């Protein structure tokens, strides 16, 4: 009996209980999903006596697992070909890793763990670090790091995360903790196809490894989904607290729970609070696109919504942007400053973004500002679902199934609410999980049925 509270003056369970007249208590509780399901089975199918209604007394200090077993067993149970064998032990157990799934990332984003290329040159102690170009005033990038399949060179090439406009506020977030060498190898063995169990000794930052994995997977796959699963709420709370310093938009973050839980980190990831915050962010995007419309200088006395905002973006901003494109890629440092009608738009921004000296730098600035207005229209594309979903829980599910690529879930909670997740968008292309030994074999295999096969094959990577 997971008790919510006792009887009051108005017969309702507690949530300052009222004037407790007398020494009786009549309290309602709800232990689990399948709480009134085992007695239902006994009264309906086996026709045996009553367990939940034969009551005698109460004393203080499961069937959800059995229903999950029944479902997973009587479905196709098509598991990932690299993990079903590693779960039944048959097959060489060095196989579920990266070095025995064939499709290793040719060159992945090893961005976060390294913030100095000399640091990465140390943290690659057994590979010949082939860094492309030789200016150390030019090499500390989110480099591309190919490890080949001679055959042991760390092929690091520079990269430049593209602009986002004039503003120095969105300076794209890079990590700060220089995780270990085998820890970066943990991140890589997780972000490449296979399986990975990190042996995290006390204090080593298994949760830092998890935050690194979240970041690197959001980098090397913008579209595939991440189920970050825990044994207790500590993992999800701490990993959210840590990823609060990474390059994630809050339209890509969501979670599950086991019922009632109070937000343990700074900002809410929860259902109603998240829909409300995204409604406020939608107001932000609407006012942004609208002041951009006034920057374009059209007439009109009433304001528009998400659909008209997206169509109007593609109709006006994209048209002007194609004009500037056919002026710039057809192109002086004068026209890279002038020929952008974003002067009225970045006229609420720092001093002109096309510096008027380096045509290519002015081009980066102009395309970054246009792509920023396109990210305004893109968060408008995301708020399409906020304006299409009717209820708070409805918009929670819609925004977690549609755009939120990072869903943090608890073990028994997701084992209890997996069916709803399967039906309304359980997308498990990648799993990142914490508190490994803090679960069981049951709480490790019951999540293995969050979906149905995809033409004879599972969703796992």
């Amino acid at each position: 009996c997971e008790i919510q509270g006792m009887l009051d003056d108005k017969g309702r369970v507690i949530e300052p209980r009222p004037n407790l007249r007398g020494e009786s208590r009549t309290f309602r509780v709800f232990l689990d999903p399948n709480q009134y399901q085992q007695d239902m089975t006994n009264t309906i199918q086996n026709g045996a006596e009553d367990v939940y209604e034969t009551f005698n007394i109460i004393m203080r200090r499961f069937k959800a697992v059995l229903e999950t077993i029944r479902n997973l067993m009587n479905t196709d149970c098509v598991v990932p070909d690299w993990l079903h064998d590693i779960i039944l032990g048959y097959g060489d157990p060095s196989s579920a890793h990266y070095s025995k799934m064939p499709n290793q990332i040719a060159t992945l984003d090893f961005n976060d763990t390294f913030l100095s290329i000399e640091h990465l040159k140390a943290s690659f102690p057994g590979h010949n670090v082939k860094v492309t170009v030789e200016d150390p005033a030019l090499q500390i990038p989110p480099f591309r790091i190919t490890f080949p399949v001679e055959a042991k060179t760390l092929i690091v090439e520079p990269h430049v995360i593209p602009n986002r406009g004039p503003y120095p506020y969105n300076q794209p977030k890079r990590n700060t903790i220089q995780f270990t060498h085998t820890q970066i190898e943990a991140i890589r063995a997780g972000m490449q196809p296979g399986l990975t169990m990190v042996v995290g000794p006390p204090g080593t930052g298994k949760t830092d490894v998890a935050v690194q994995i979240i970041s690197n997977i959001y980098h090397n796959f913008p579209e595939q989904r991440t189920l970050i699963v825990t044994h207790s709420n500590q993992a999800l709370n701490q990993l959210f607290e840590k990823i609060m310093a990474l390059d994630i938009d809050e339209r890509h973050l969501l979670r599950l729970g086991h019922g009632e839980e109070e937000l343990e980190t700074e900002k809410d990831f929860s259902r109603y609070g998240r829909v409300n915050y995204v409604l406020a962010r939608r107001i932000e995007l609407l006012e942004e696109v609208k002041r951009l419309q006034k920057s374009l200088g059209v007439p009109g006395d009433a304001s528009y919504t998400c659909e008209t905002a997206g169509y109007f973006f593609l109709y006006q901003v994209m048209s002007r942007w194609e004009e500037y494109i056919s002026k710039v890629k057809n192109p002086d440092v004068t026209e890279v400053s002038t020929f952008f009608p974003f002067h009225e738009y970045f006229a609420n921004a720092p001093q002109p973004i096309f510096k008027g000296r380096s045509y290519e730098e002015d081009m980066e600035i102009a395309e970054g500002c246009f792509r920023h207005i396109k990210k305004i229209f893109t968060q408008l594309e995301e708020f399409r679902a906020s304006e299409l979903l009717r209820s708070g829980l409805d918009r929670s599910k819609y925004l977690l199934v549609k755009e939120a690529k990072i869903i943090a879930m608890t073990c028994t909670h997701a084992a209890l609410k997996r069916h709803d997740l399967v039906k309304l968008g359980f997308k498990y292309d990648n799993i990142l999980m914490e508190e490994a030994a803090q679960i069981l074999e049951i709480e490790t295999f019951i999540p293995l049925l969050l979906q149905n096969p995809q033409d004879g094959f599972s969703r796992l990577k």
Partner: protein, 243 residues
């Protein structure tokens, strides 16, 4: 401010026609766009004049002429963009498709829908990435329940059954049902004779659309000449006798 003198400076502009187009766009977007027909015939005559030269600066000046003639937006700048689309359909480079589709769907009308969707059709030829990608983005793009239907009927003609079934799924999730039936029959032609695809397509089609025993008995003859002889076939034919 006489459109006469404007067309006169355009059609008397000699030498390089680049000062022609620059001063033309300047003055034309300065004053009103009543010279629409003048600039249109001018663009066509200029195509007659320069279509033998490099397609870089003349076609650029023409696109500029059309987008600038589009004072705010109008019903003939999508038209001239469609003239450039049909003219560069013989591209050899898909940047023509990209830029022409941008220019023509610079609005959201019935215009350039049937210019982009057959452009995705002529994209699907030996590279299914643009086909299925435009299929997805259009199914999740400017809303019209007929566009995704047309998408299923387009992927019906190319050898990616997943794209047809994908548009079918999108429309059934949200003639169209009959067109989904036609695409189901197209992928149900007796090639995958494992006896799975045609039968499942029969069930899905007869689920979304109701035929009173017609397609039922079609699938009946199919699956009963494709059935077995053991308990499977005994039971299948008994169930068909009962249903």
């Amino acid at each position: 401010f006489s459109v006469k003198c404007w067309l006169r400076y355009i059609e008397f502009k000699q030498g390089a026609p680049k000062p022609r187009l620059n001063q033309l766009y300047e003055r034309a977007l300065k004053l009103l766009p009543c010279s629409y027909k003048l600039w249109y015939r001018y663009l066509k005559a200029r195509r007659a004049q320069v279509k033998h030269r490099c397609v870089t600066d003349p076609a650029y000046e023409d696109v500029n002429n059309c987008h600038e003639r589009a004072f705010v937006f109008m019903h003939k700048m999508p038209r001239l963009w469609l003239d450039y689309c049909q003219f560069l359909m013989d591209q050899g480079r898909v940047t023509h498709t990209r830029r022409t589709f941008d220019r023509a769907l610079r609005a959201l009308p019935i215009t350039q829908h049937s210019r982009i969707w057959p452009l995705y059709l002529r994209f699907l030829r030996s590279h299914p990435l643009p086909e299925t990608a435009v299929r997805g983005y259009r199914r999740f793009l400017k809303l019209s329940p007929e566009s995704a239907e047309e998408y299923i009927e387009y992927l019906k003609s190319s050898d990616r059954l997943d794209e047809a079934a994908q548009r079918l799924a999108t429309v059934v999730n949200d003639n169209y049902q009959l067109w989904h039936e036609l695409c189901d029959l197209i992928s149900q032609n007796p090639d995958k004779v494992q006896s799975l695809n045609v039968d499942a397509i029969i069930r899905g089609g007869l689920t979304r659309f109701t035929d009173q025993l017609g397609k039922l008995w079609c699938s009946l003859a199919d699956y009963y000449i494709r059935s077995g002889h053991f308990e499977k076939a005994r039971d299948v034919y008994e169930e068909a006798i009962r249903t």
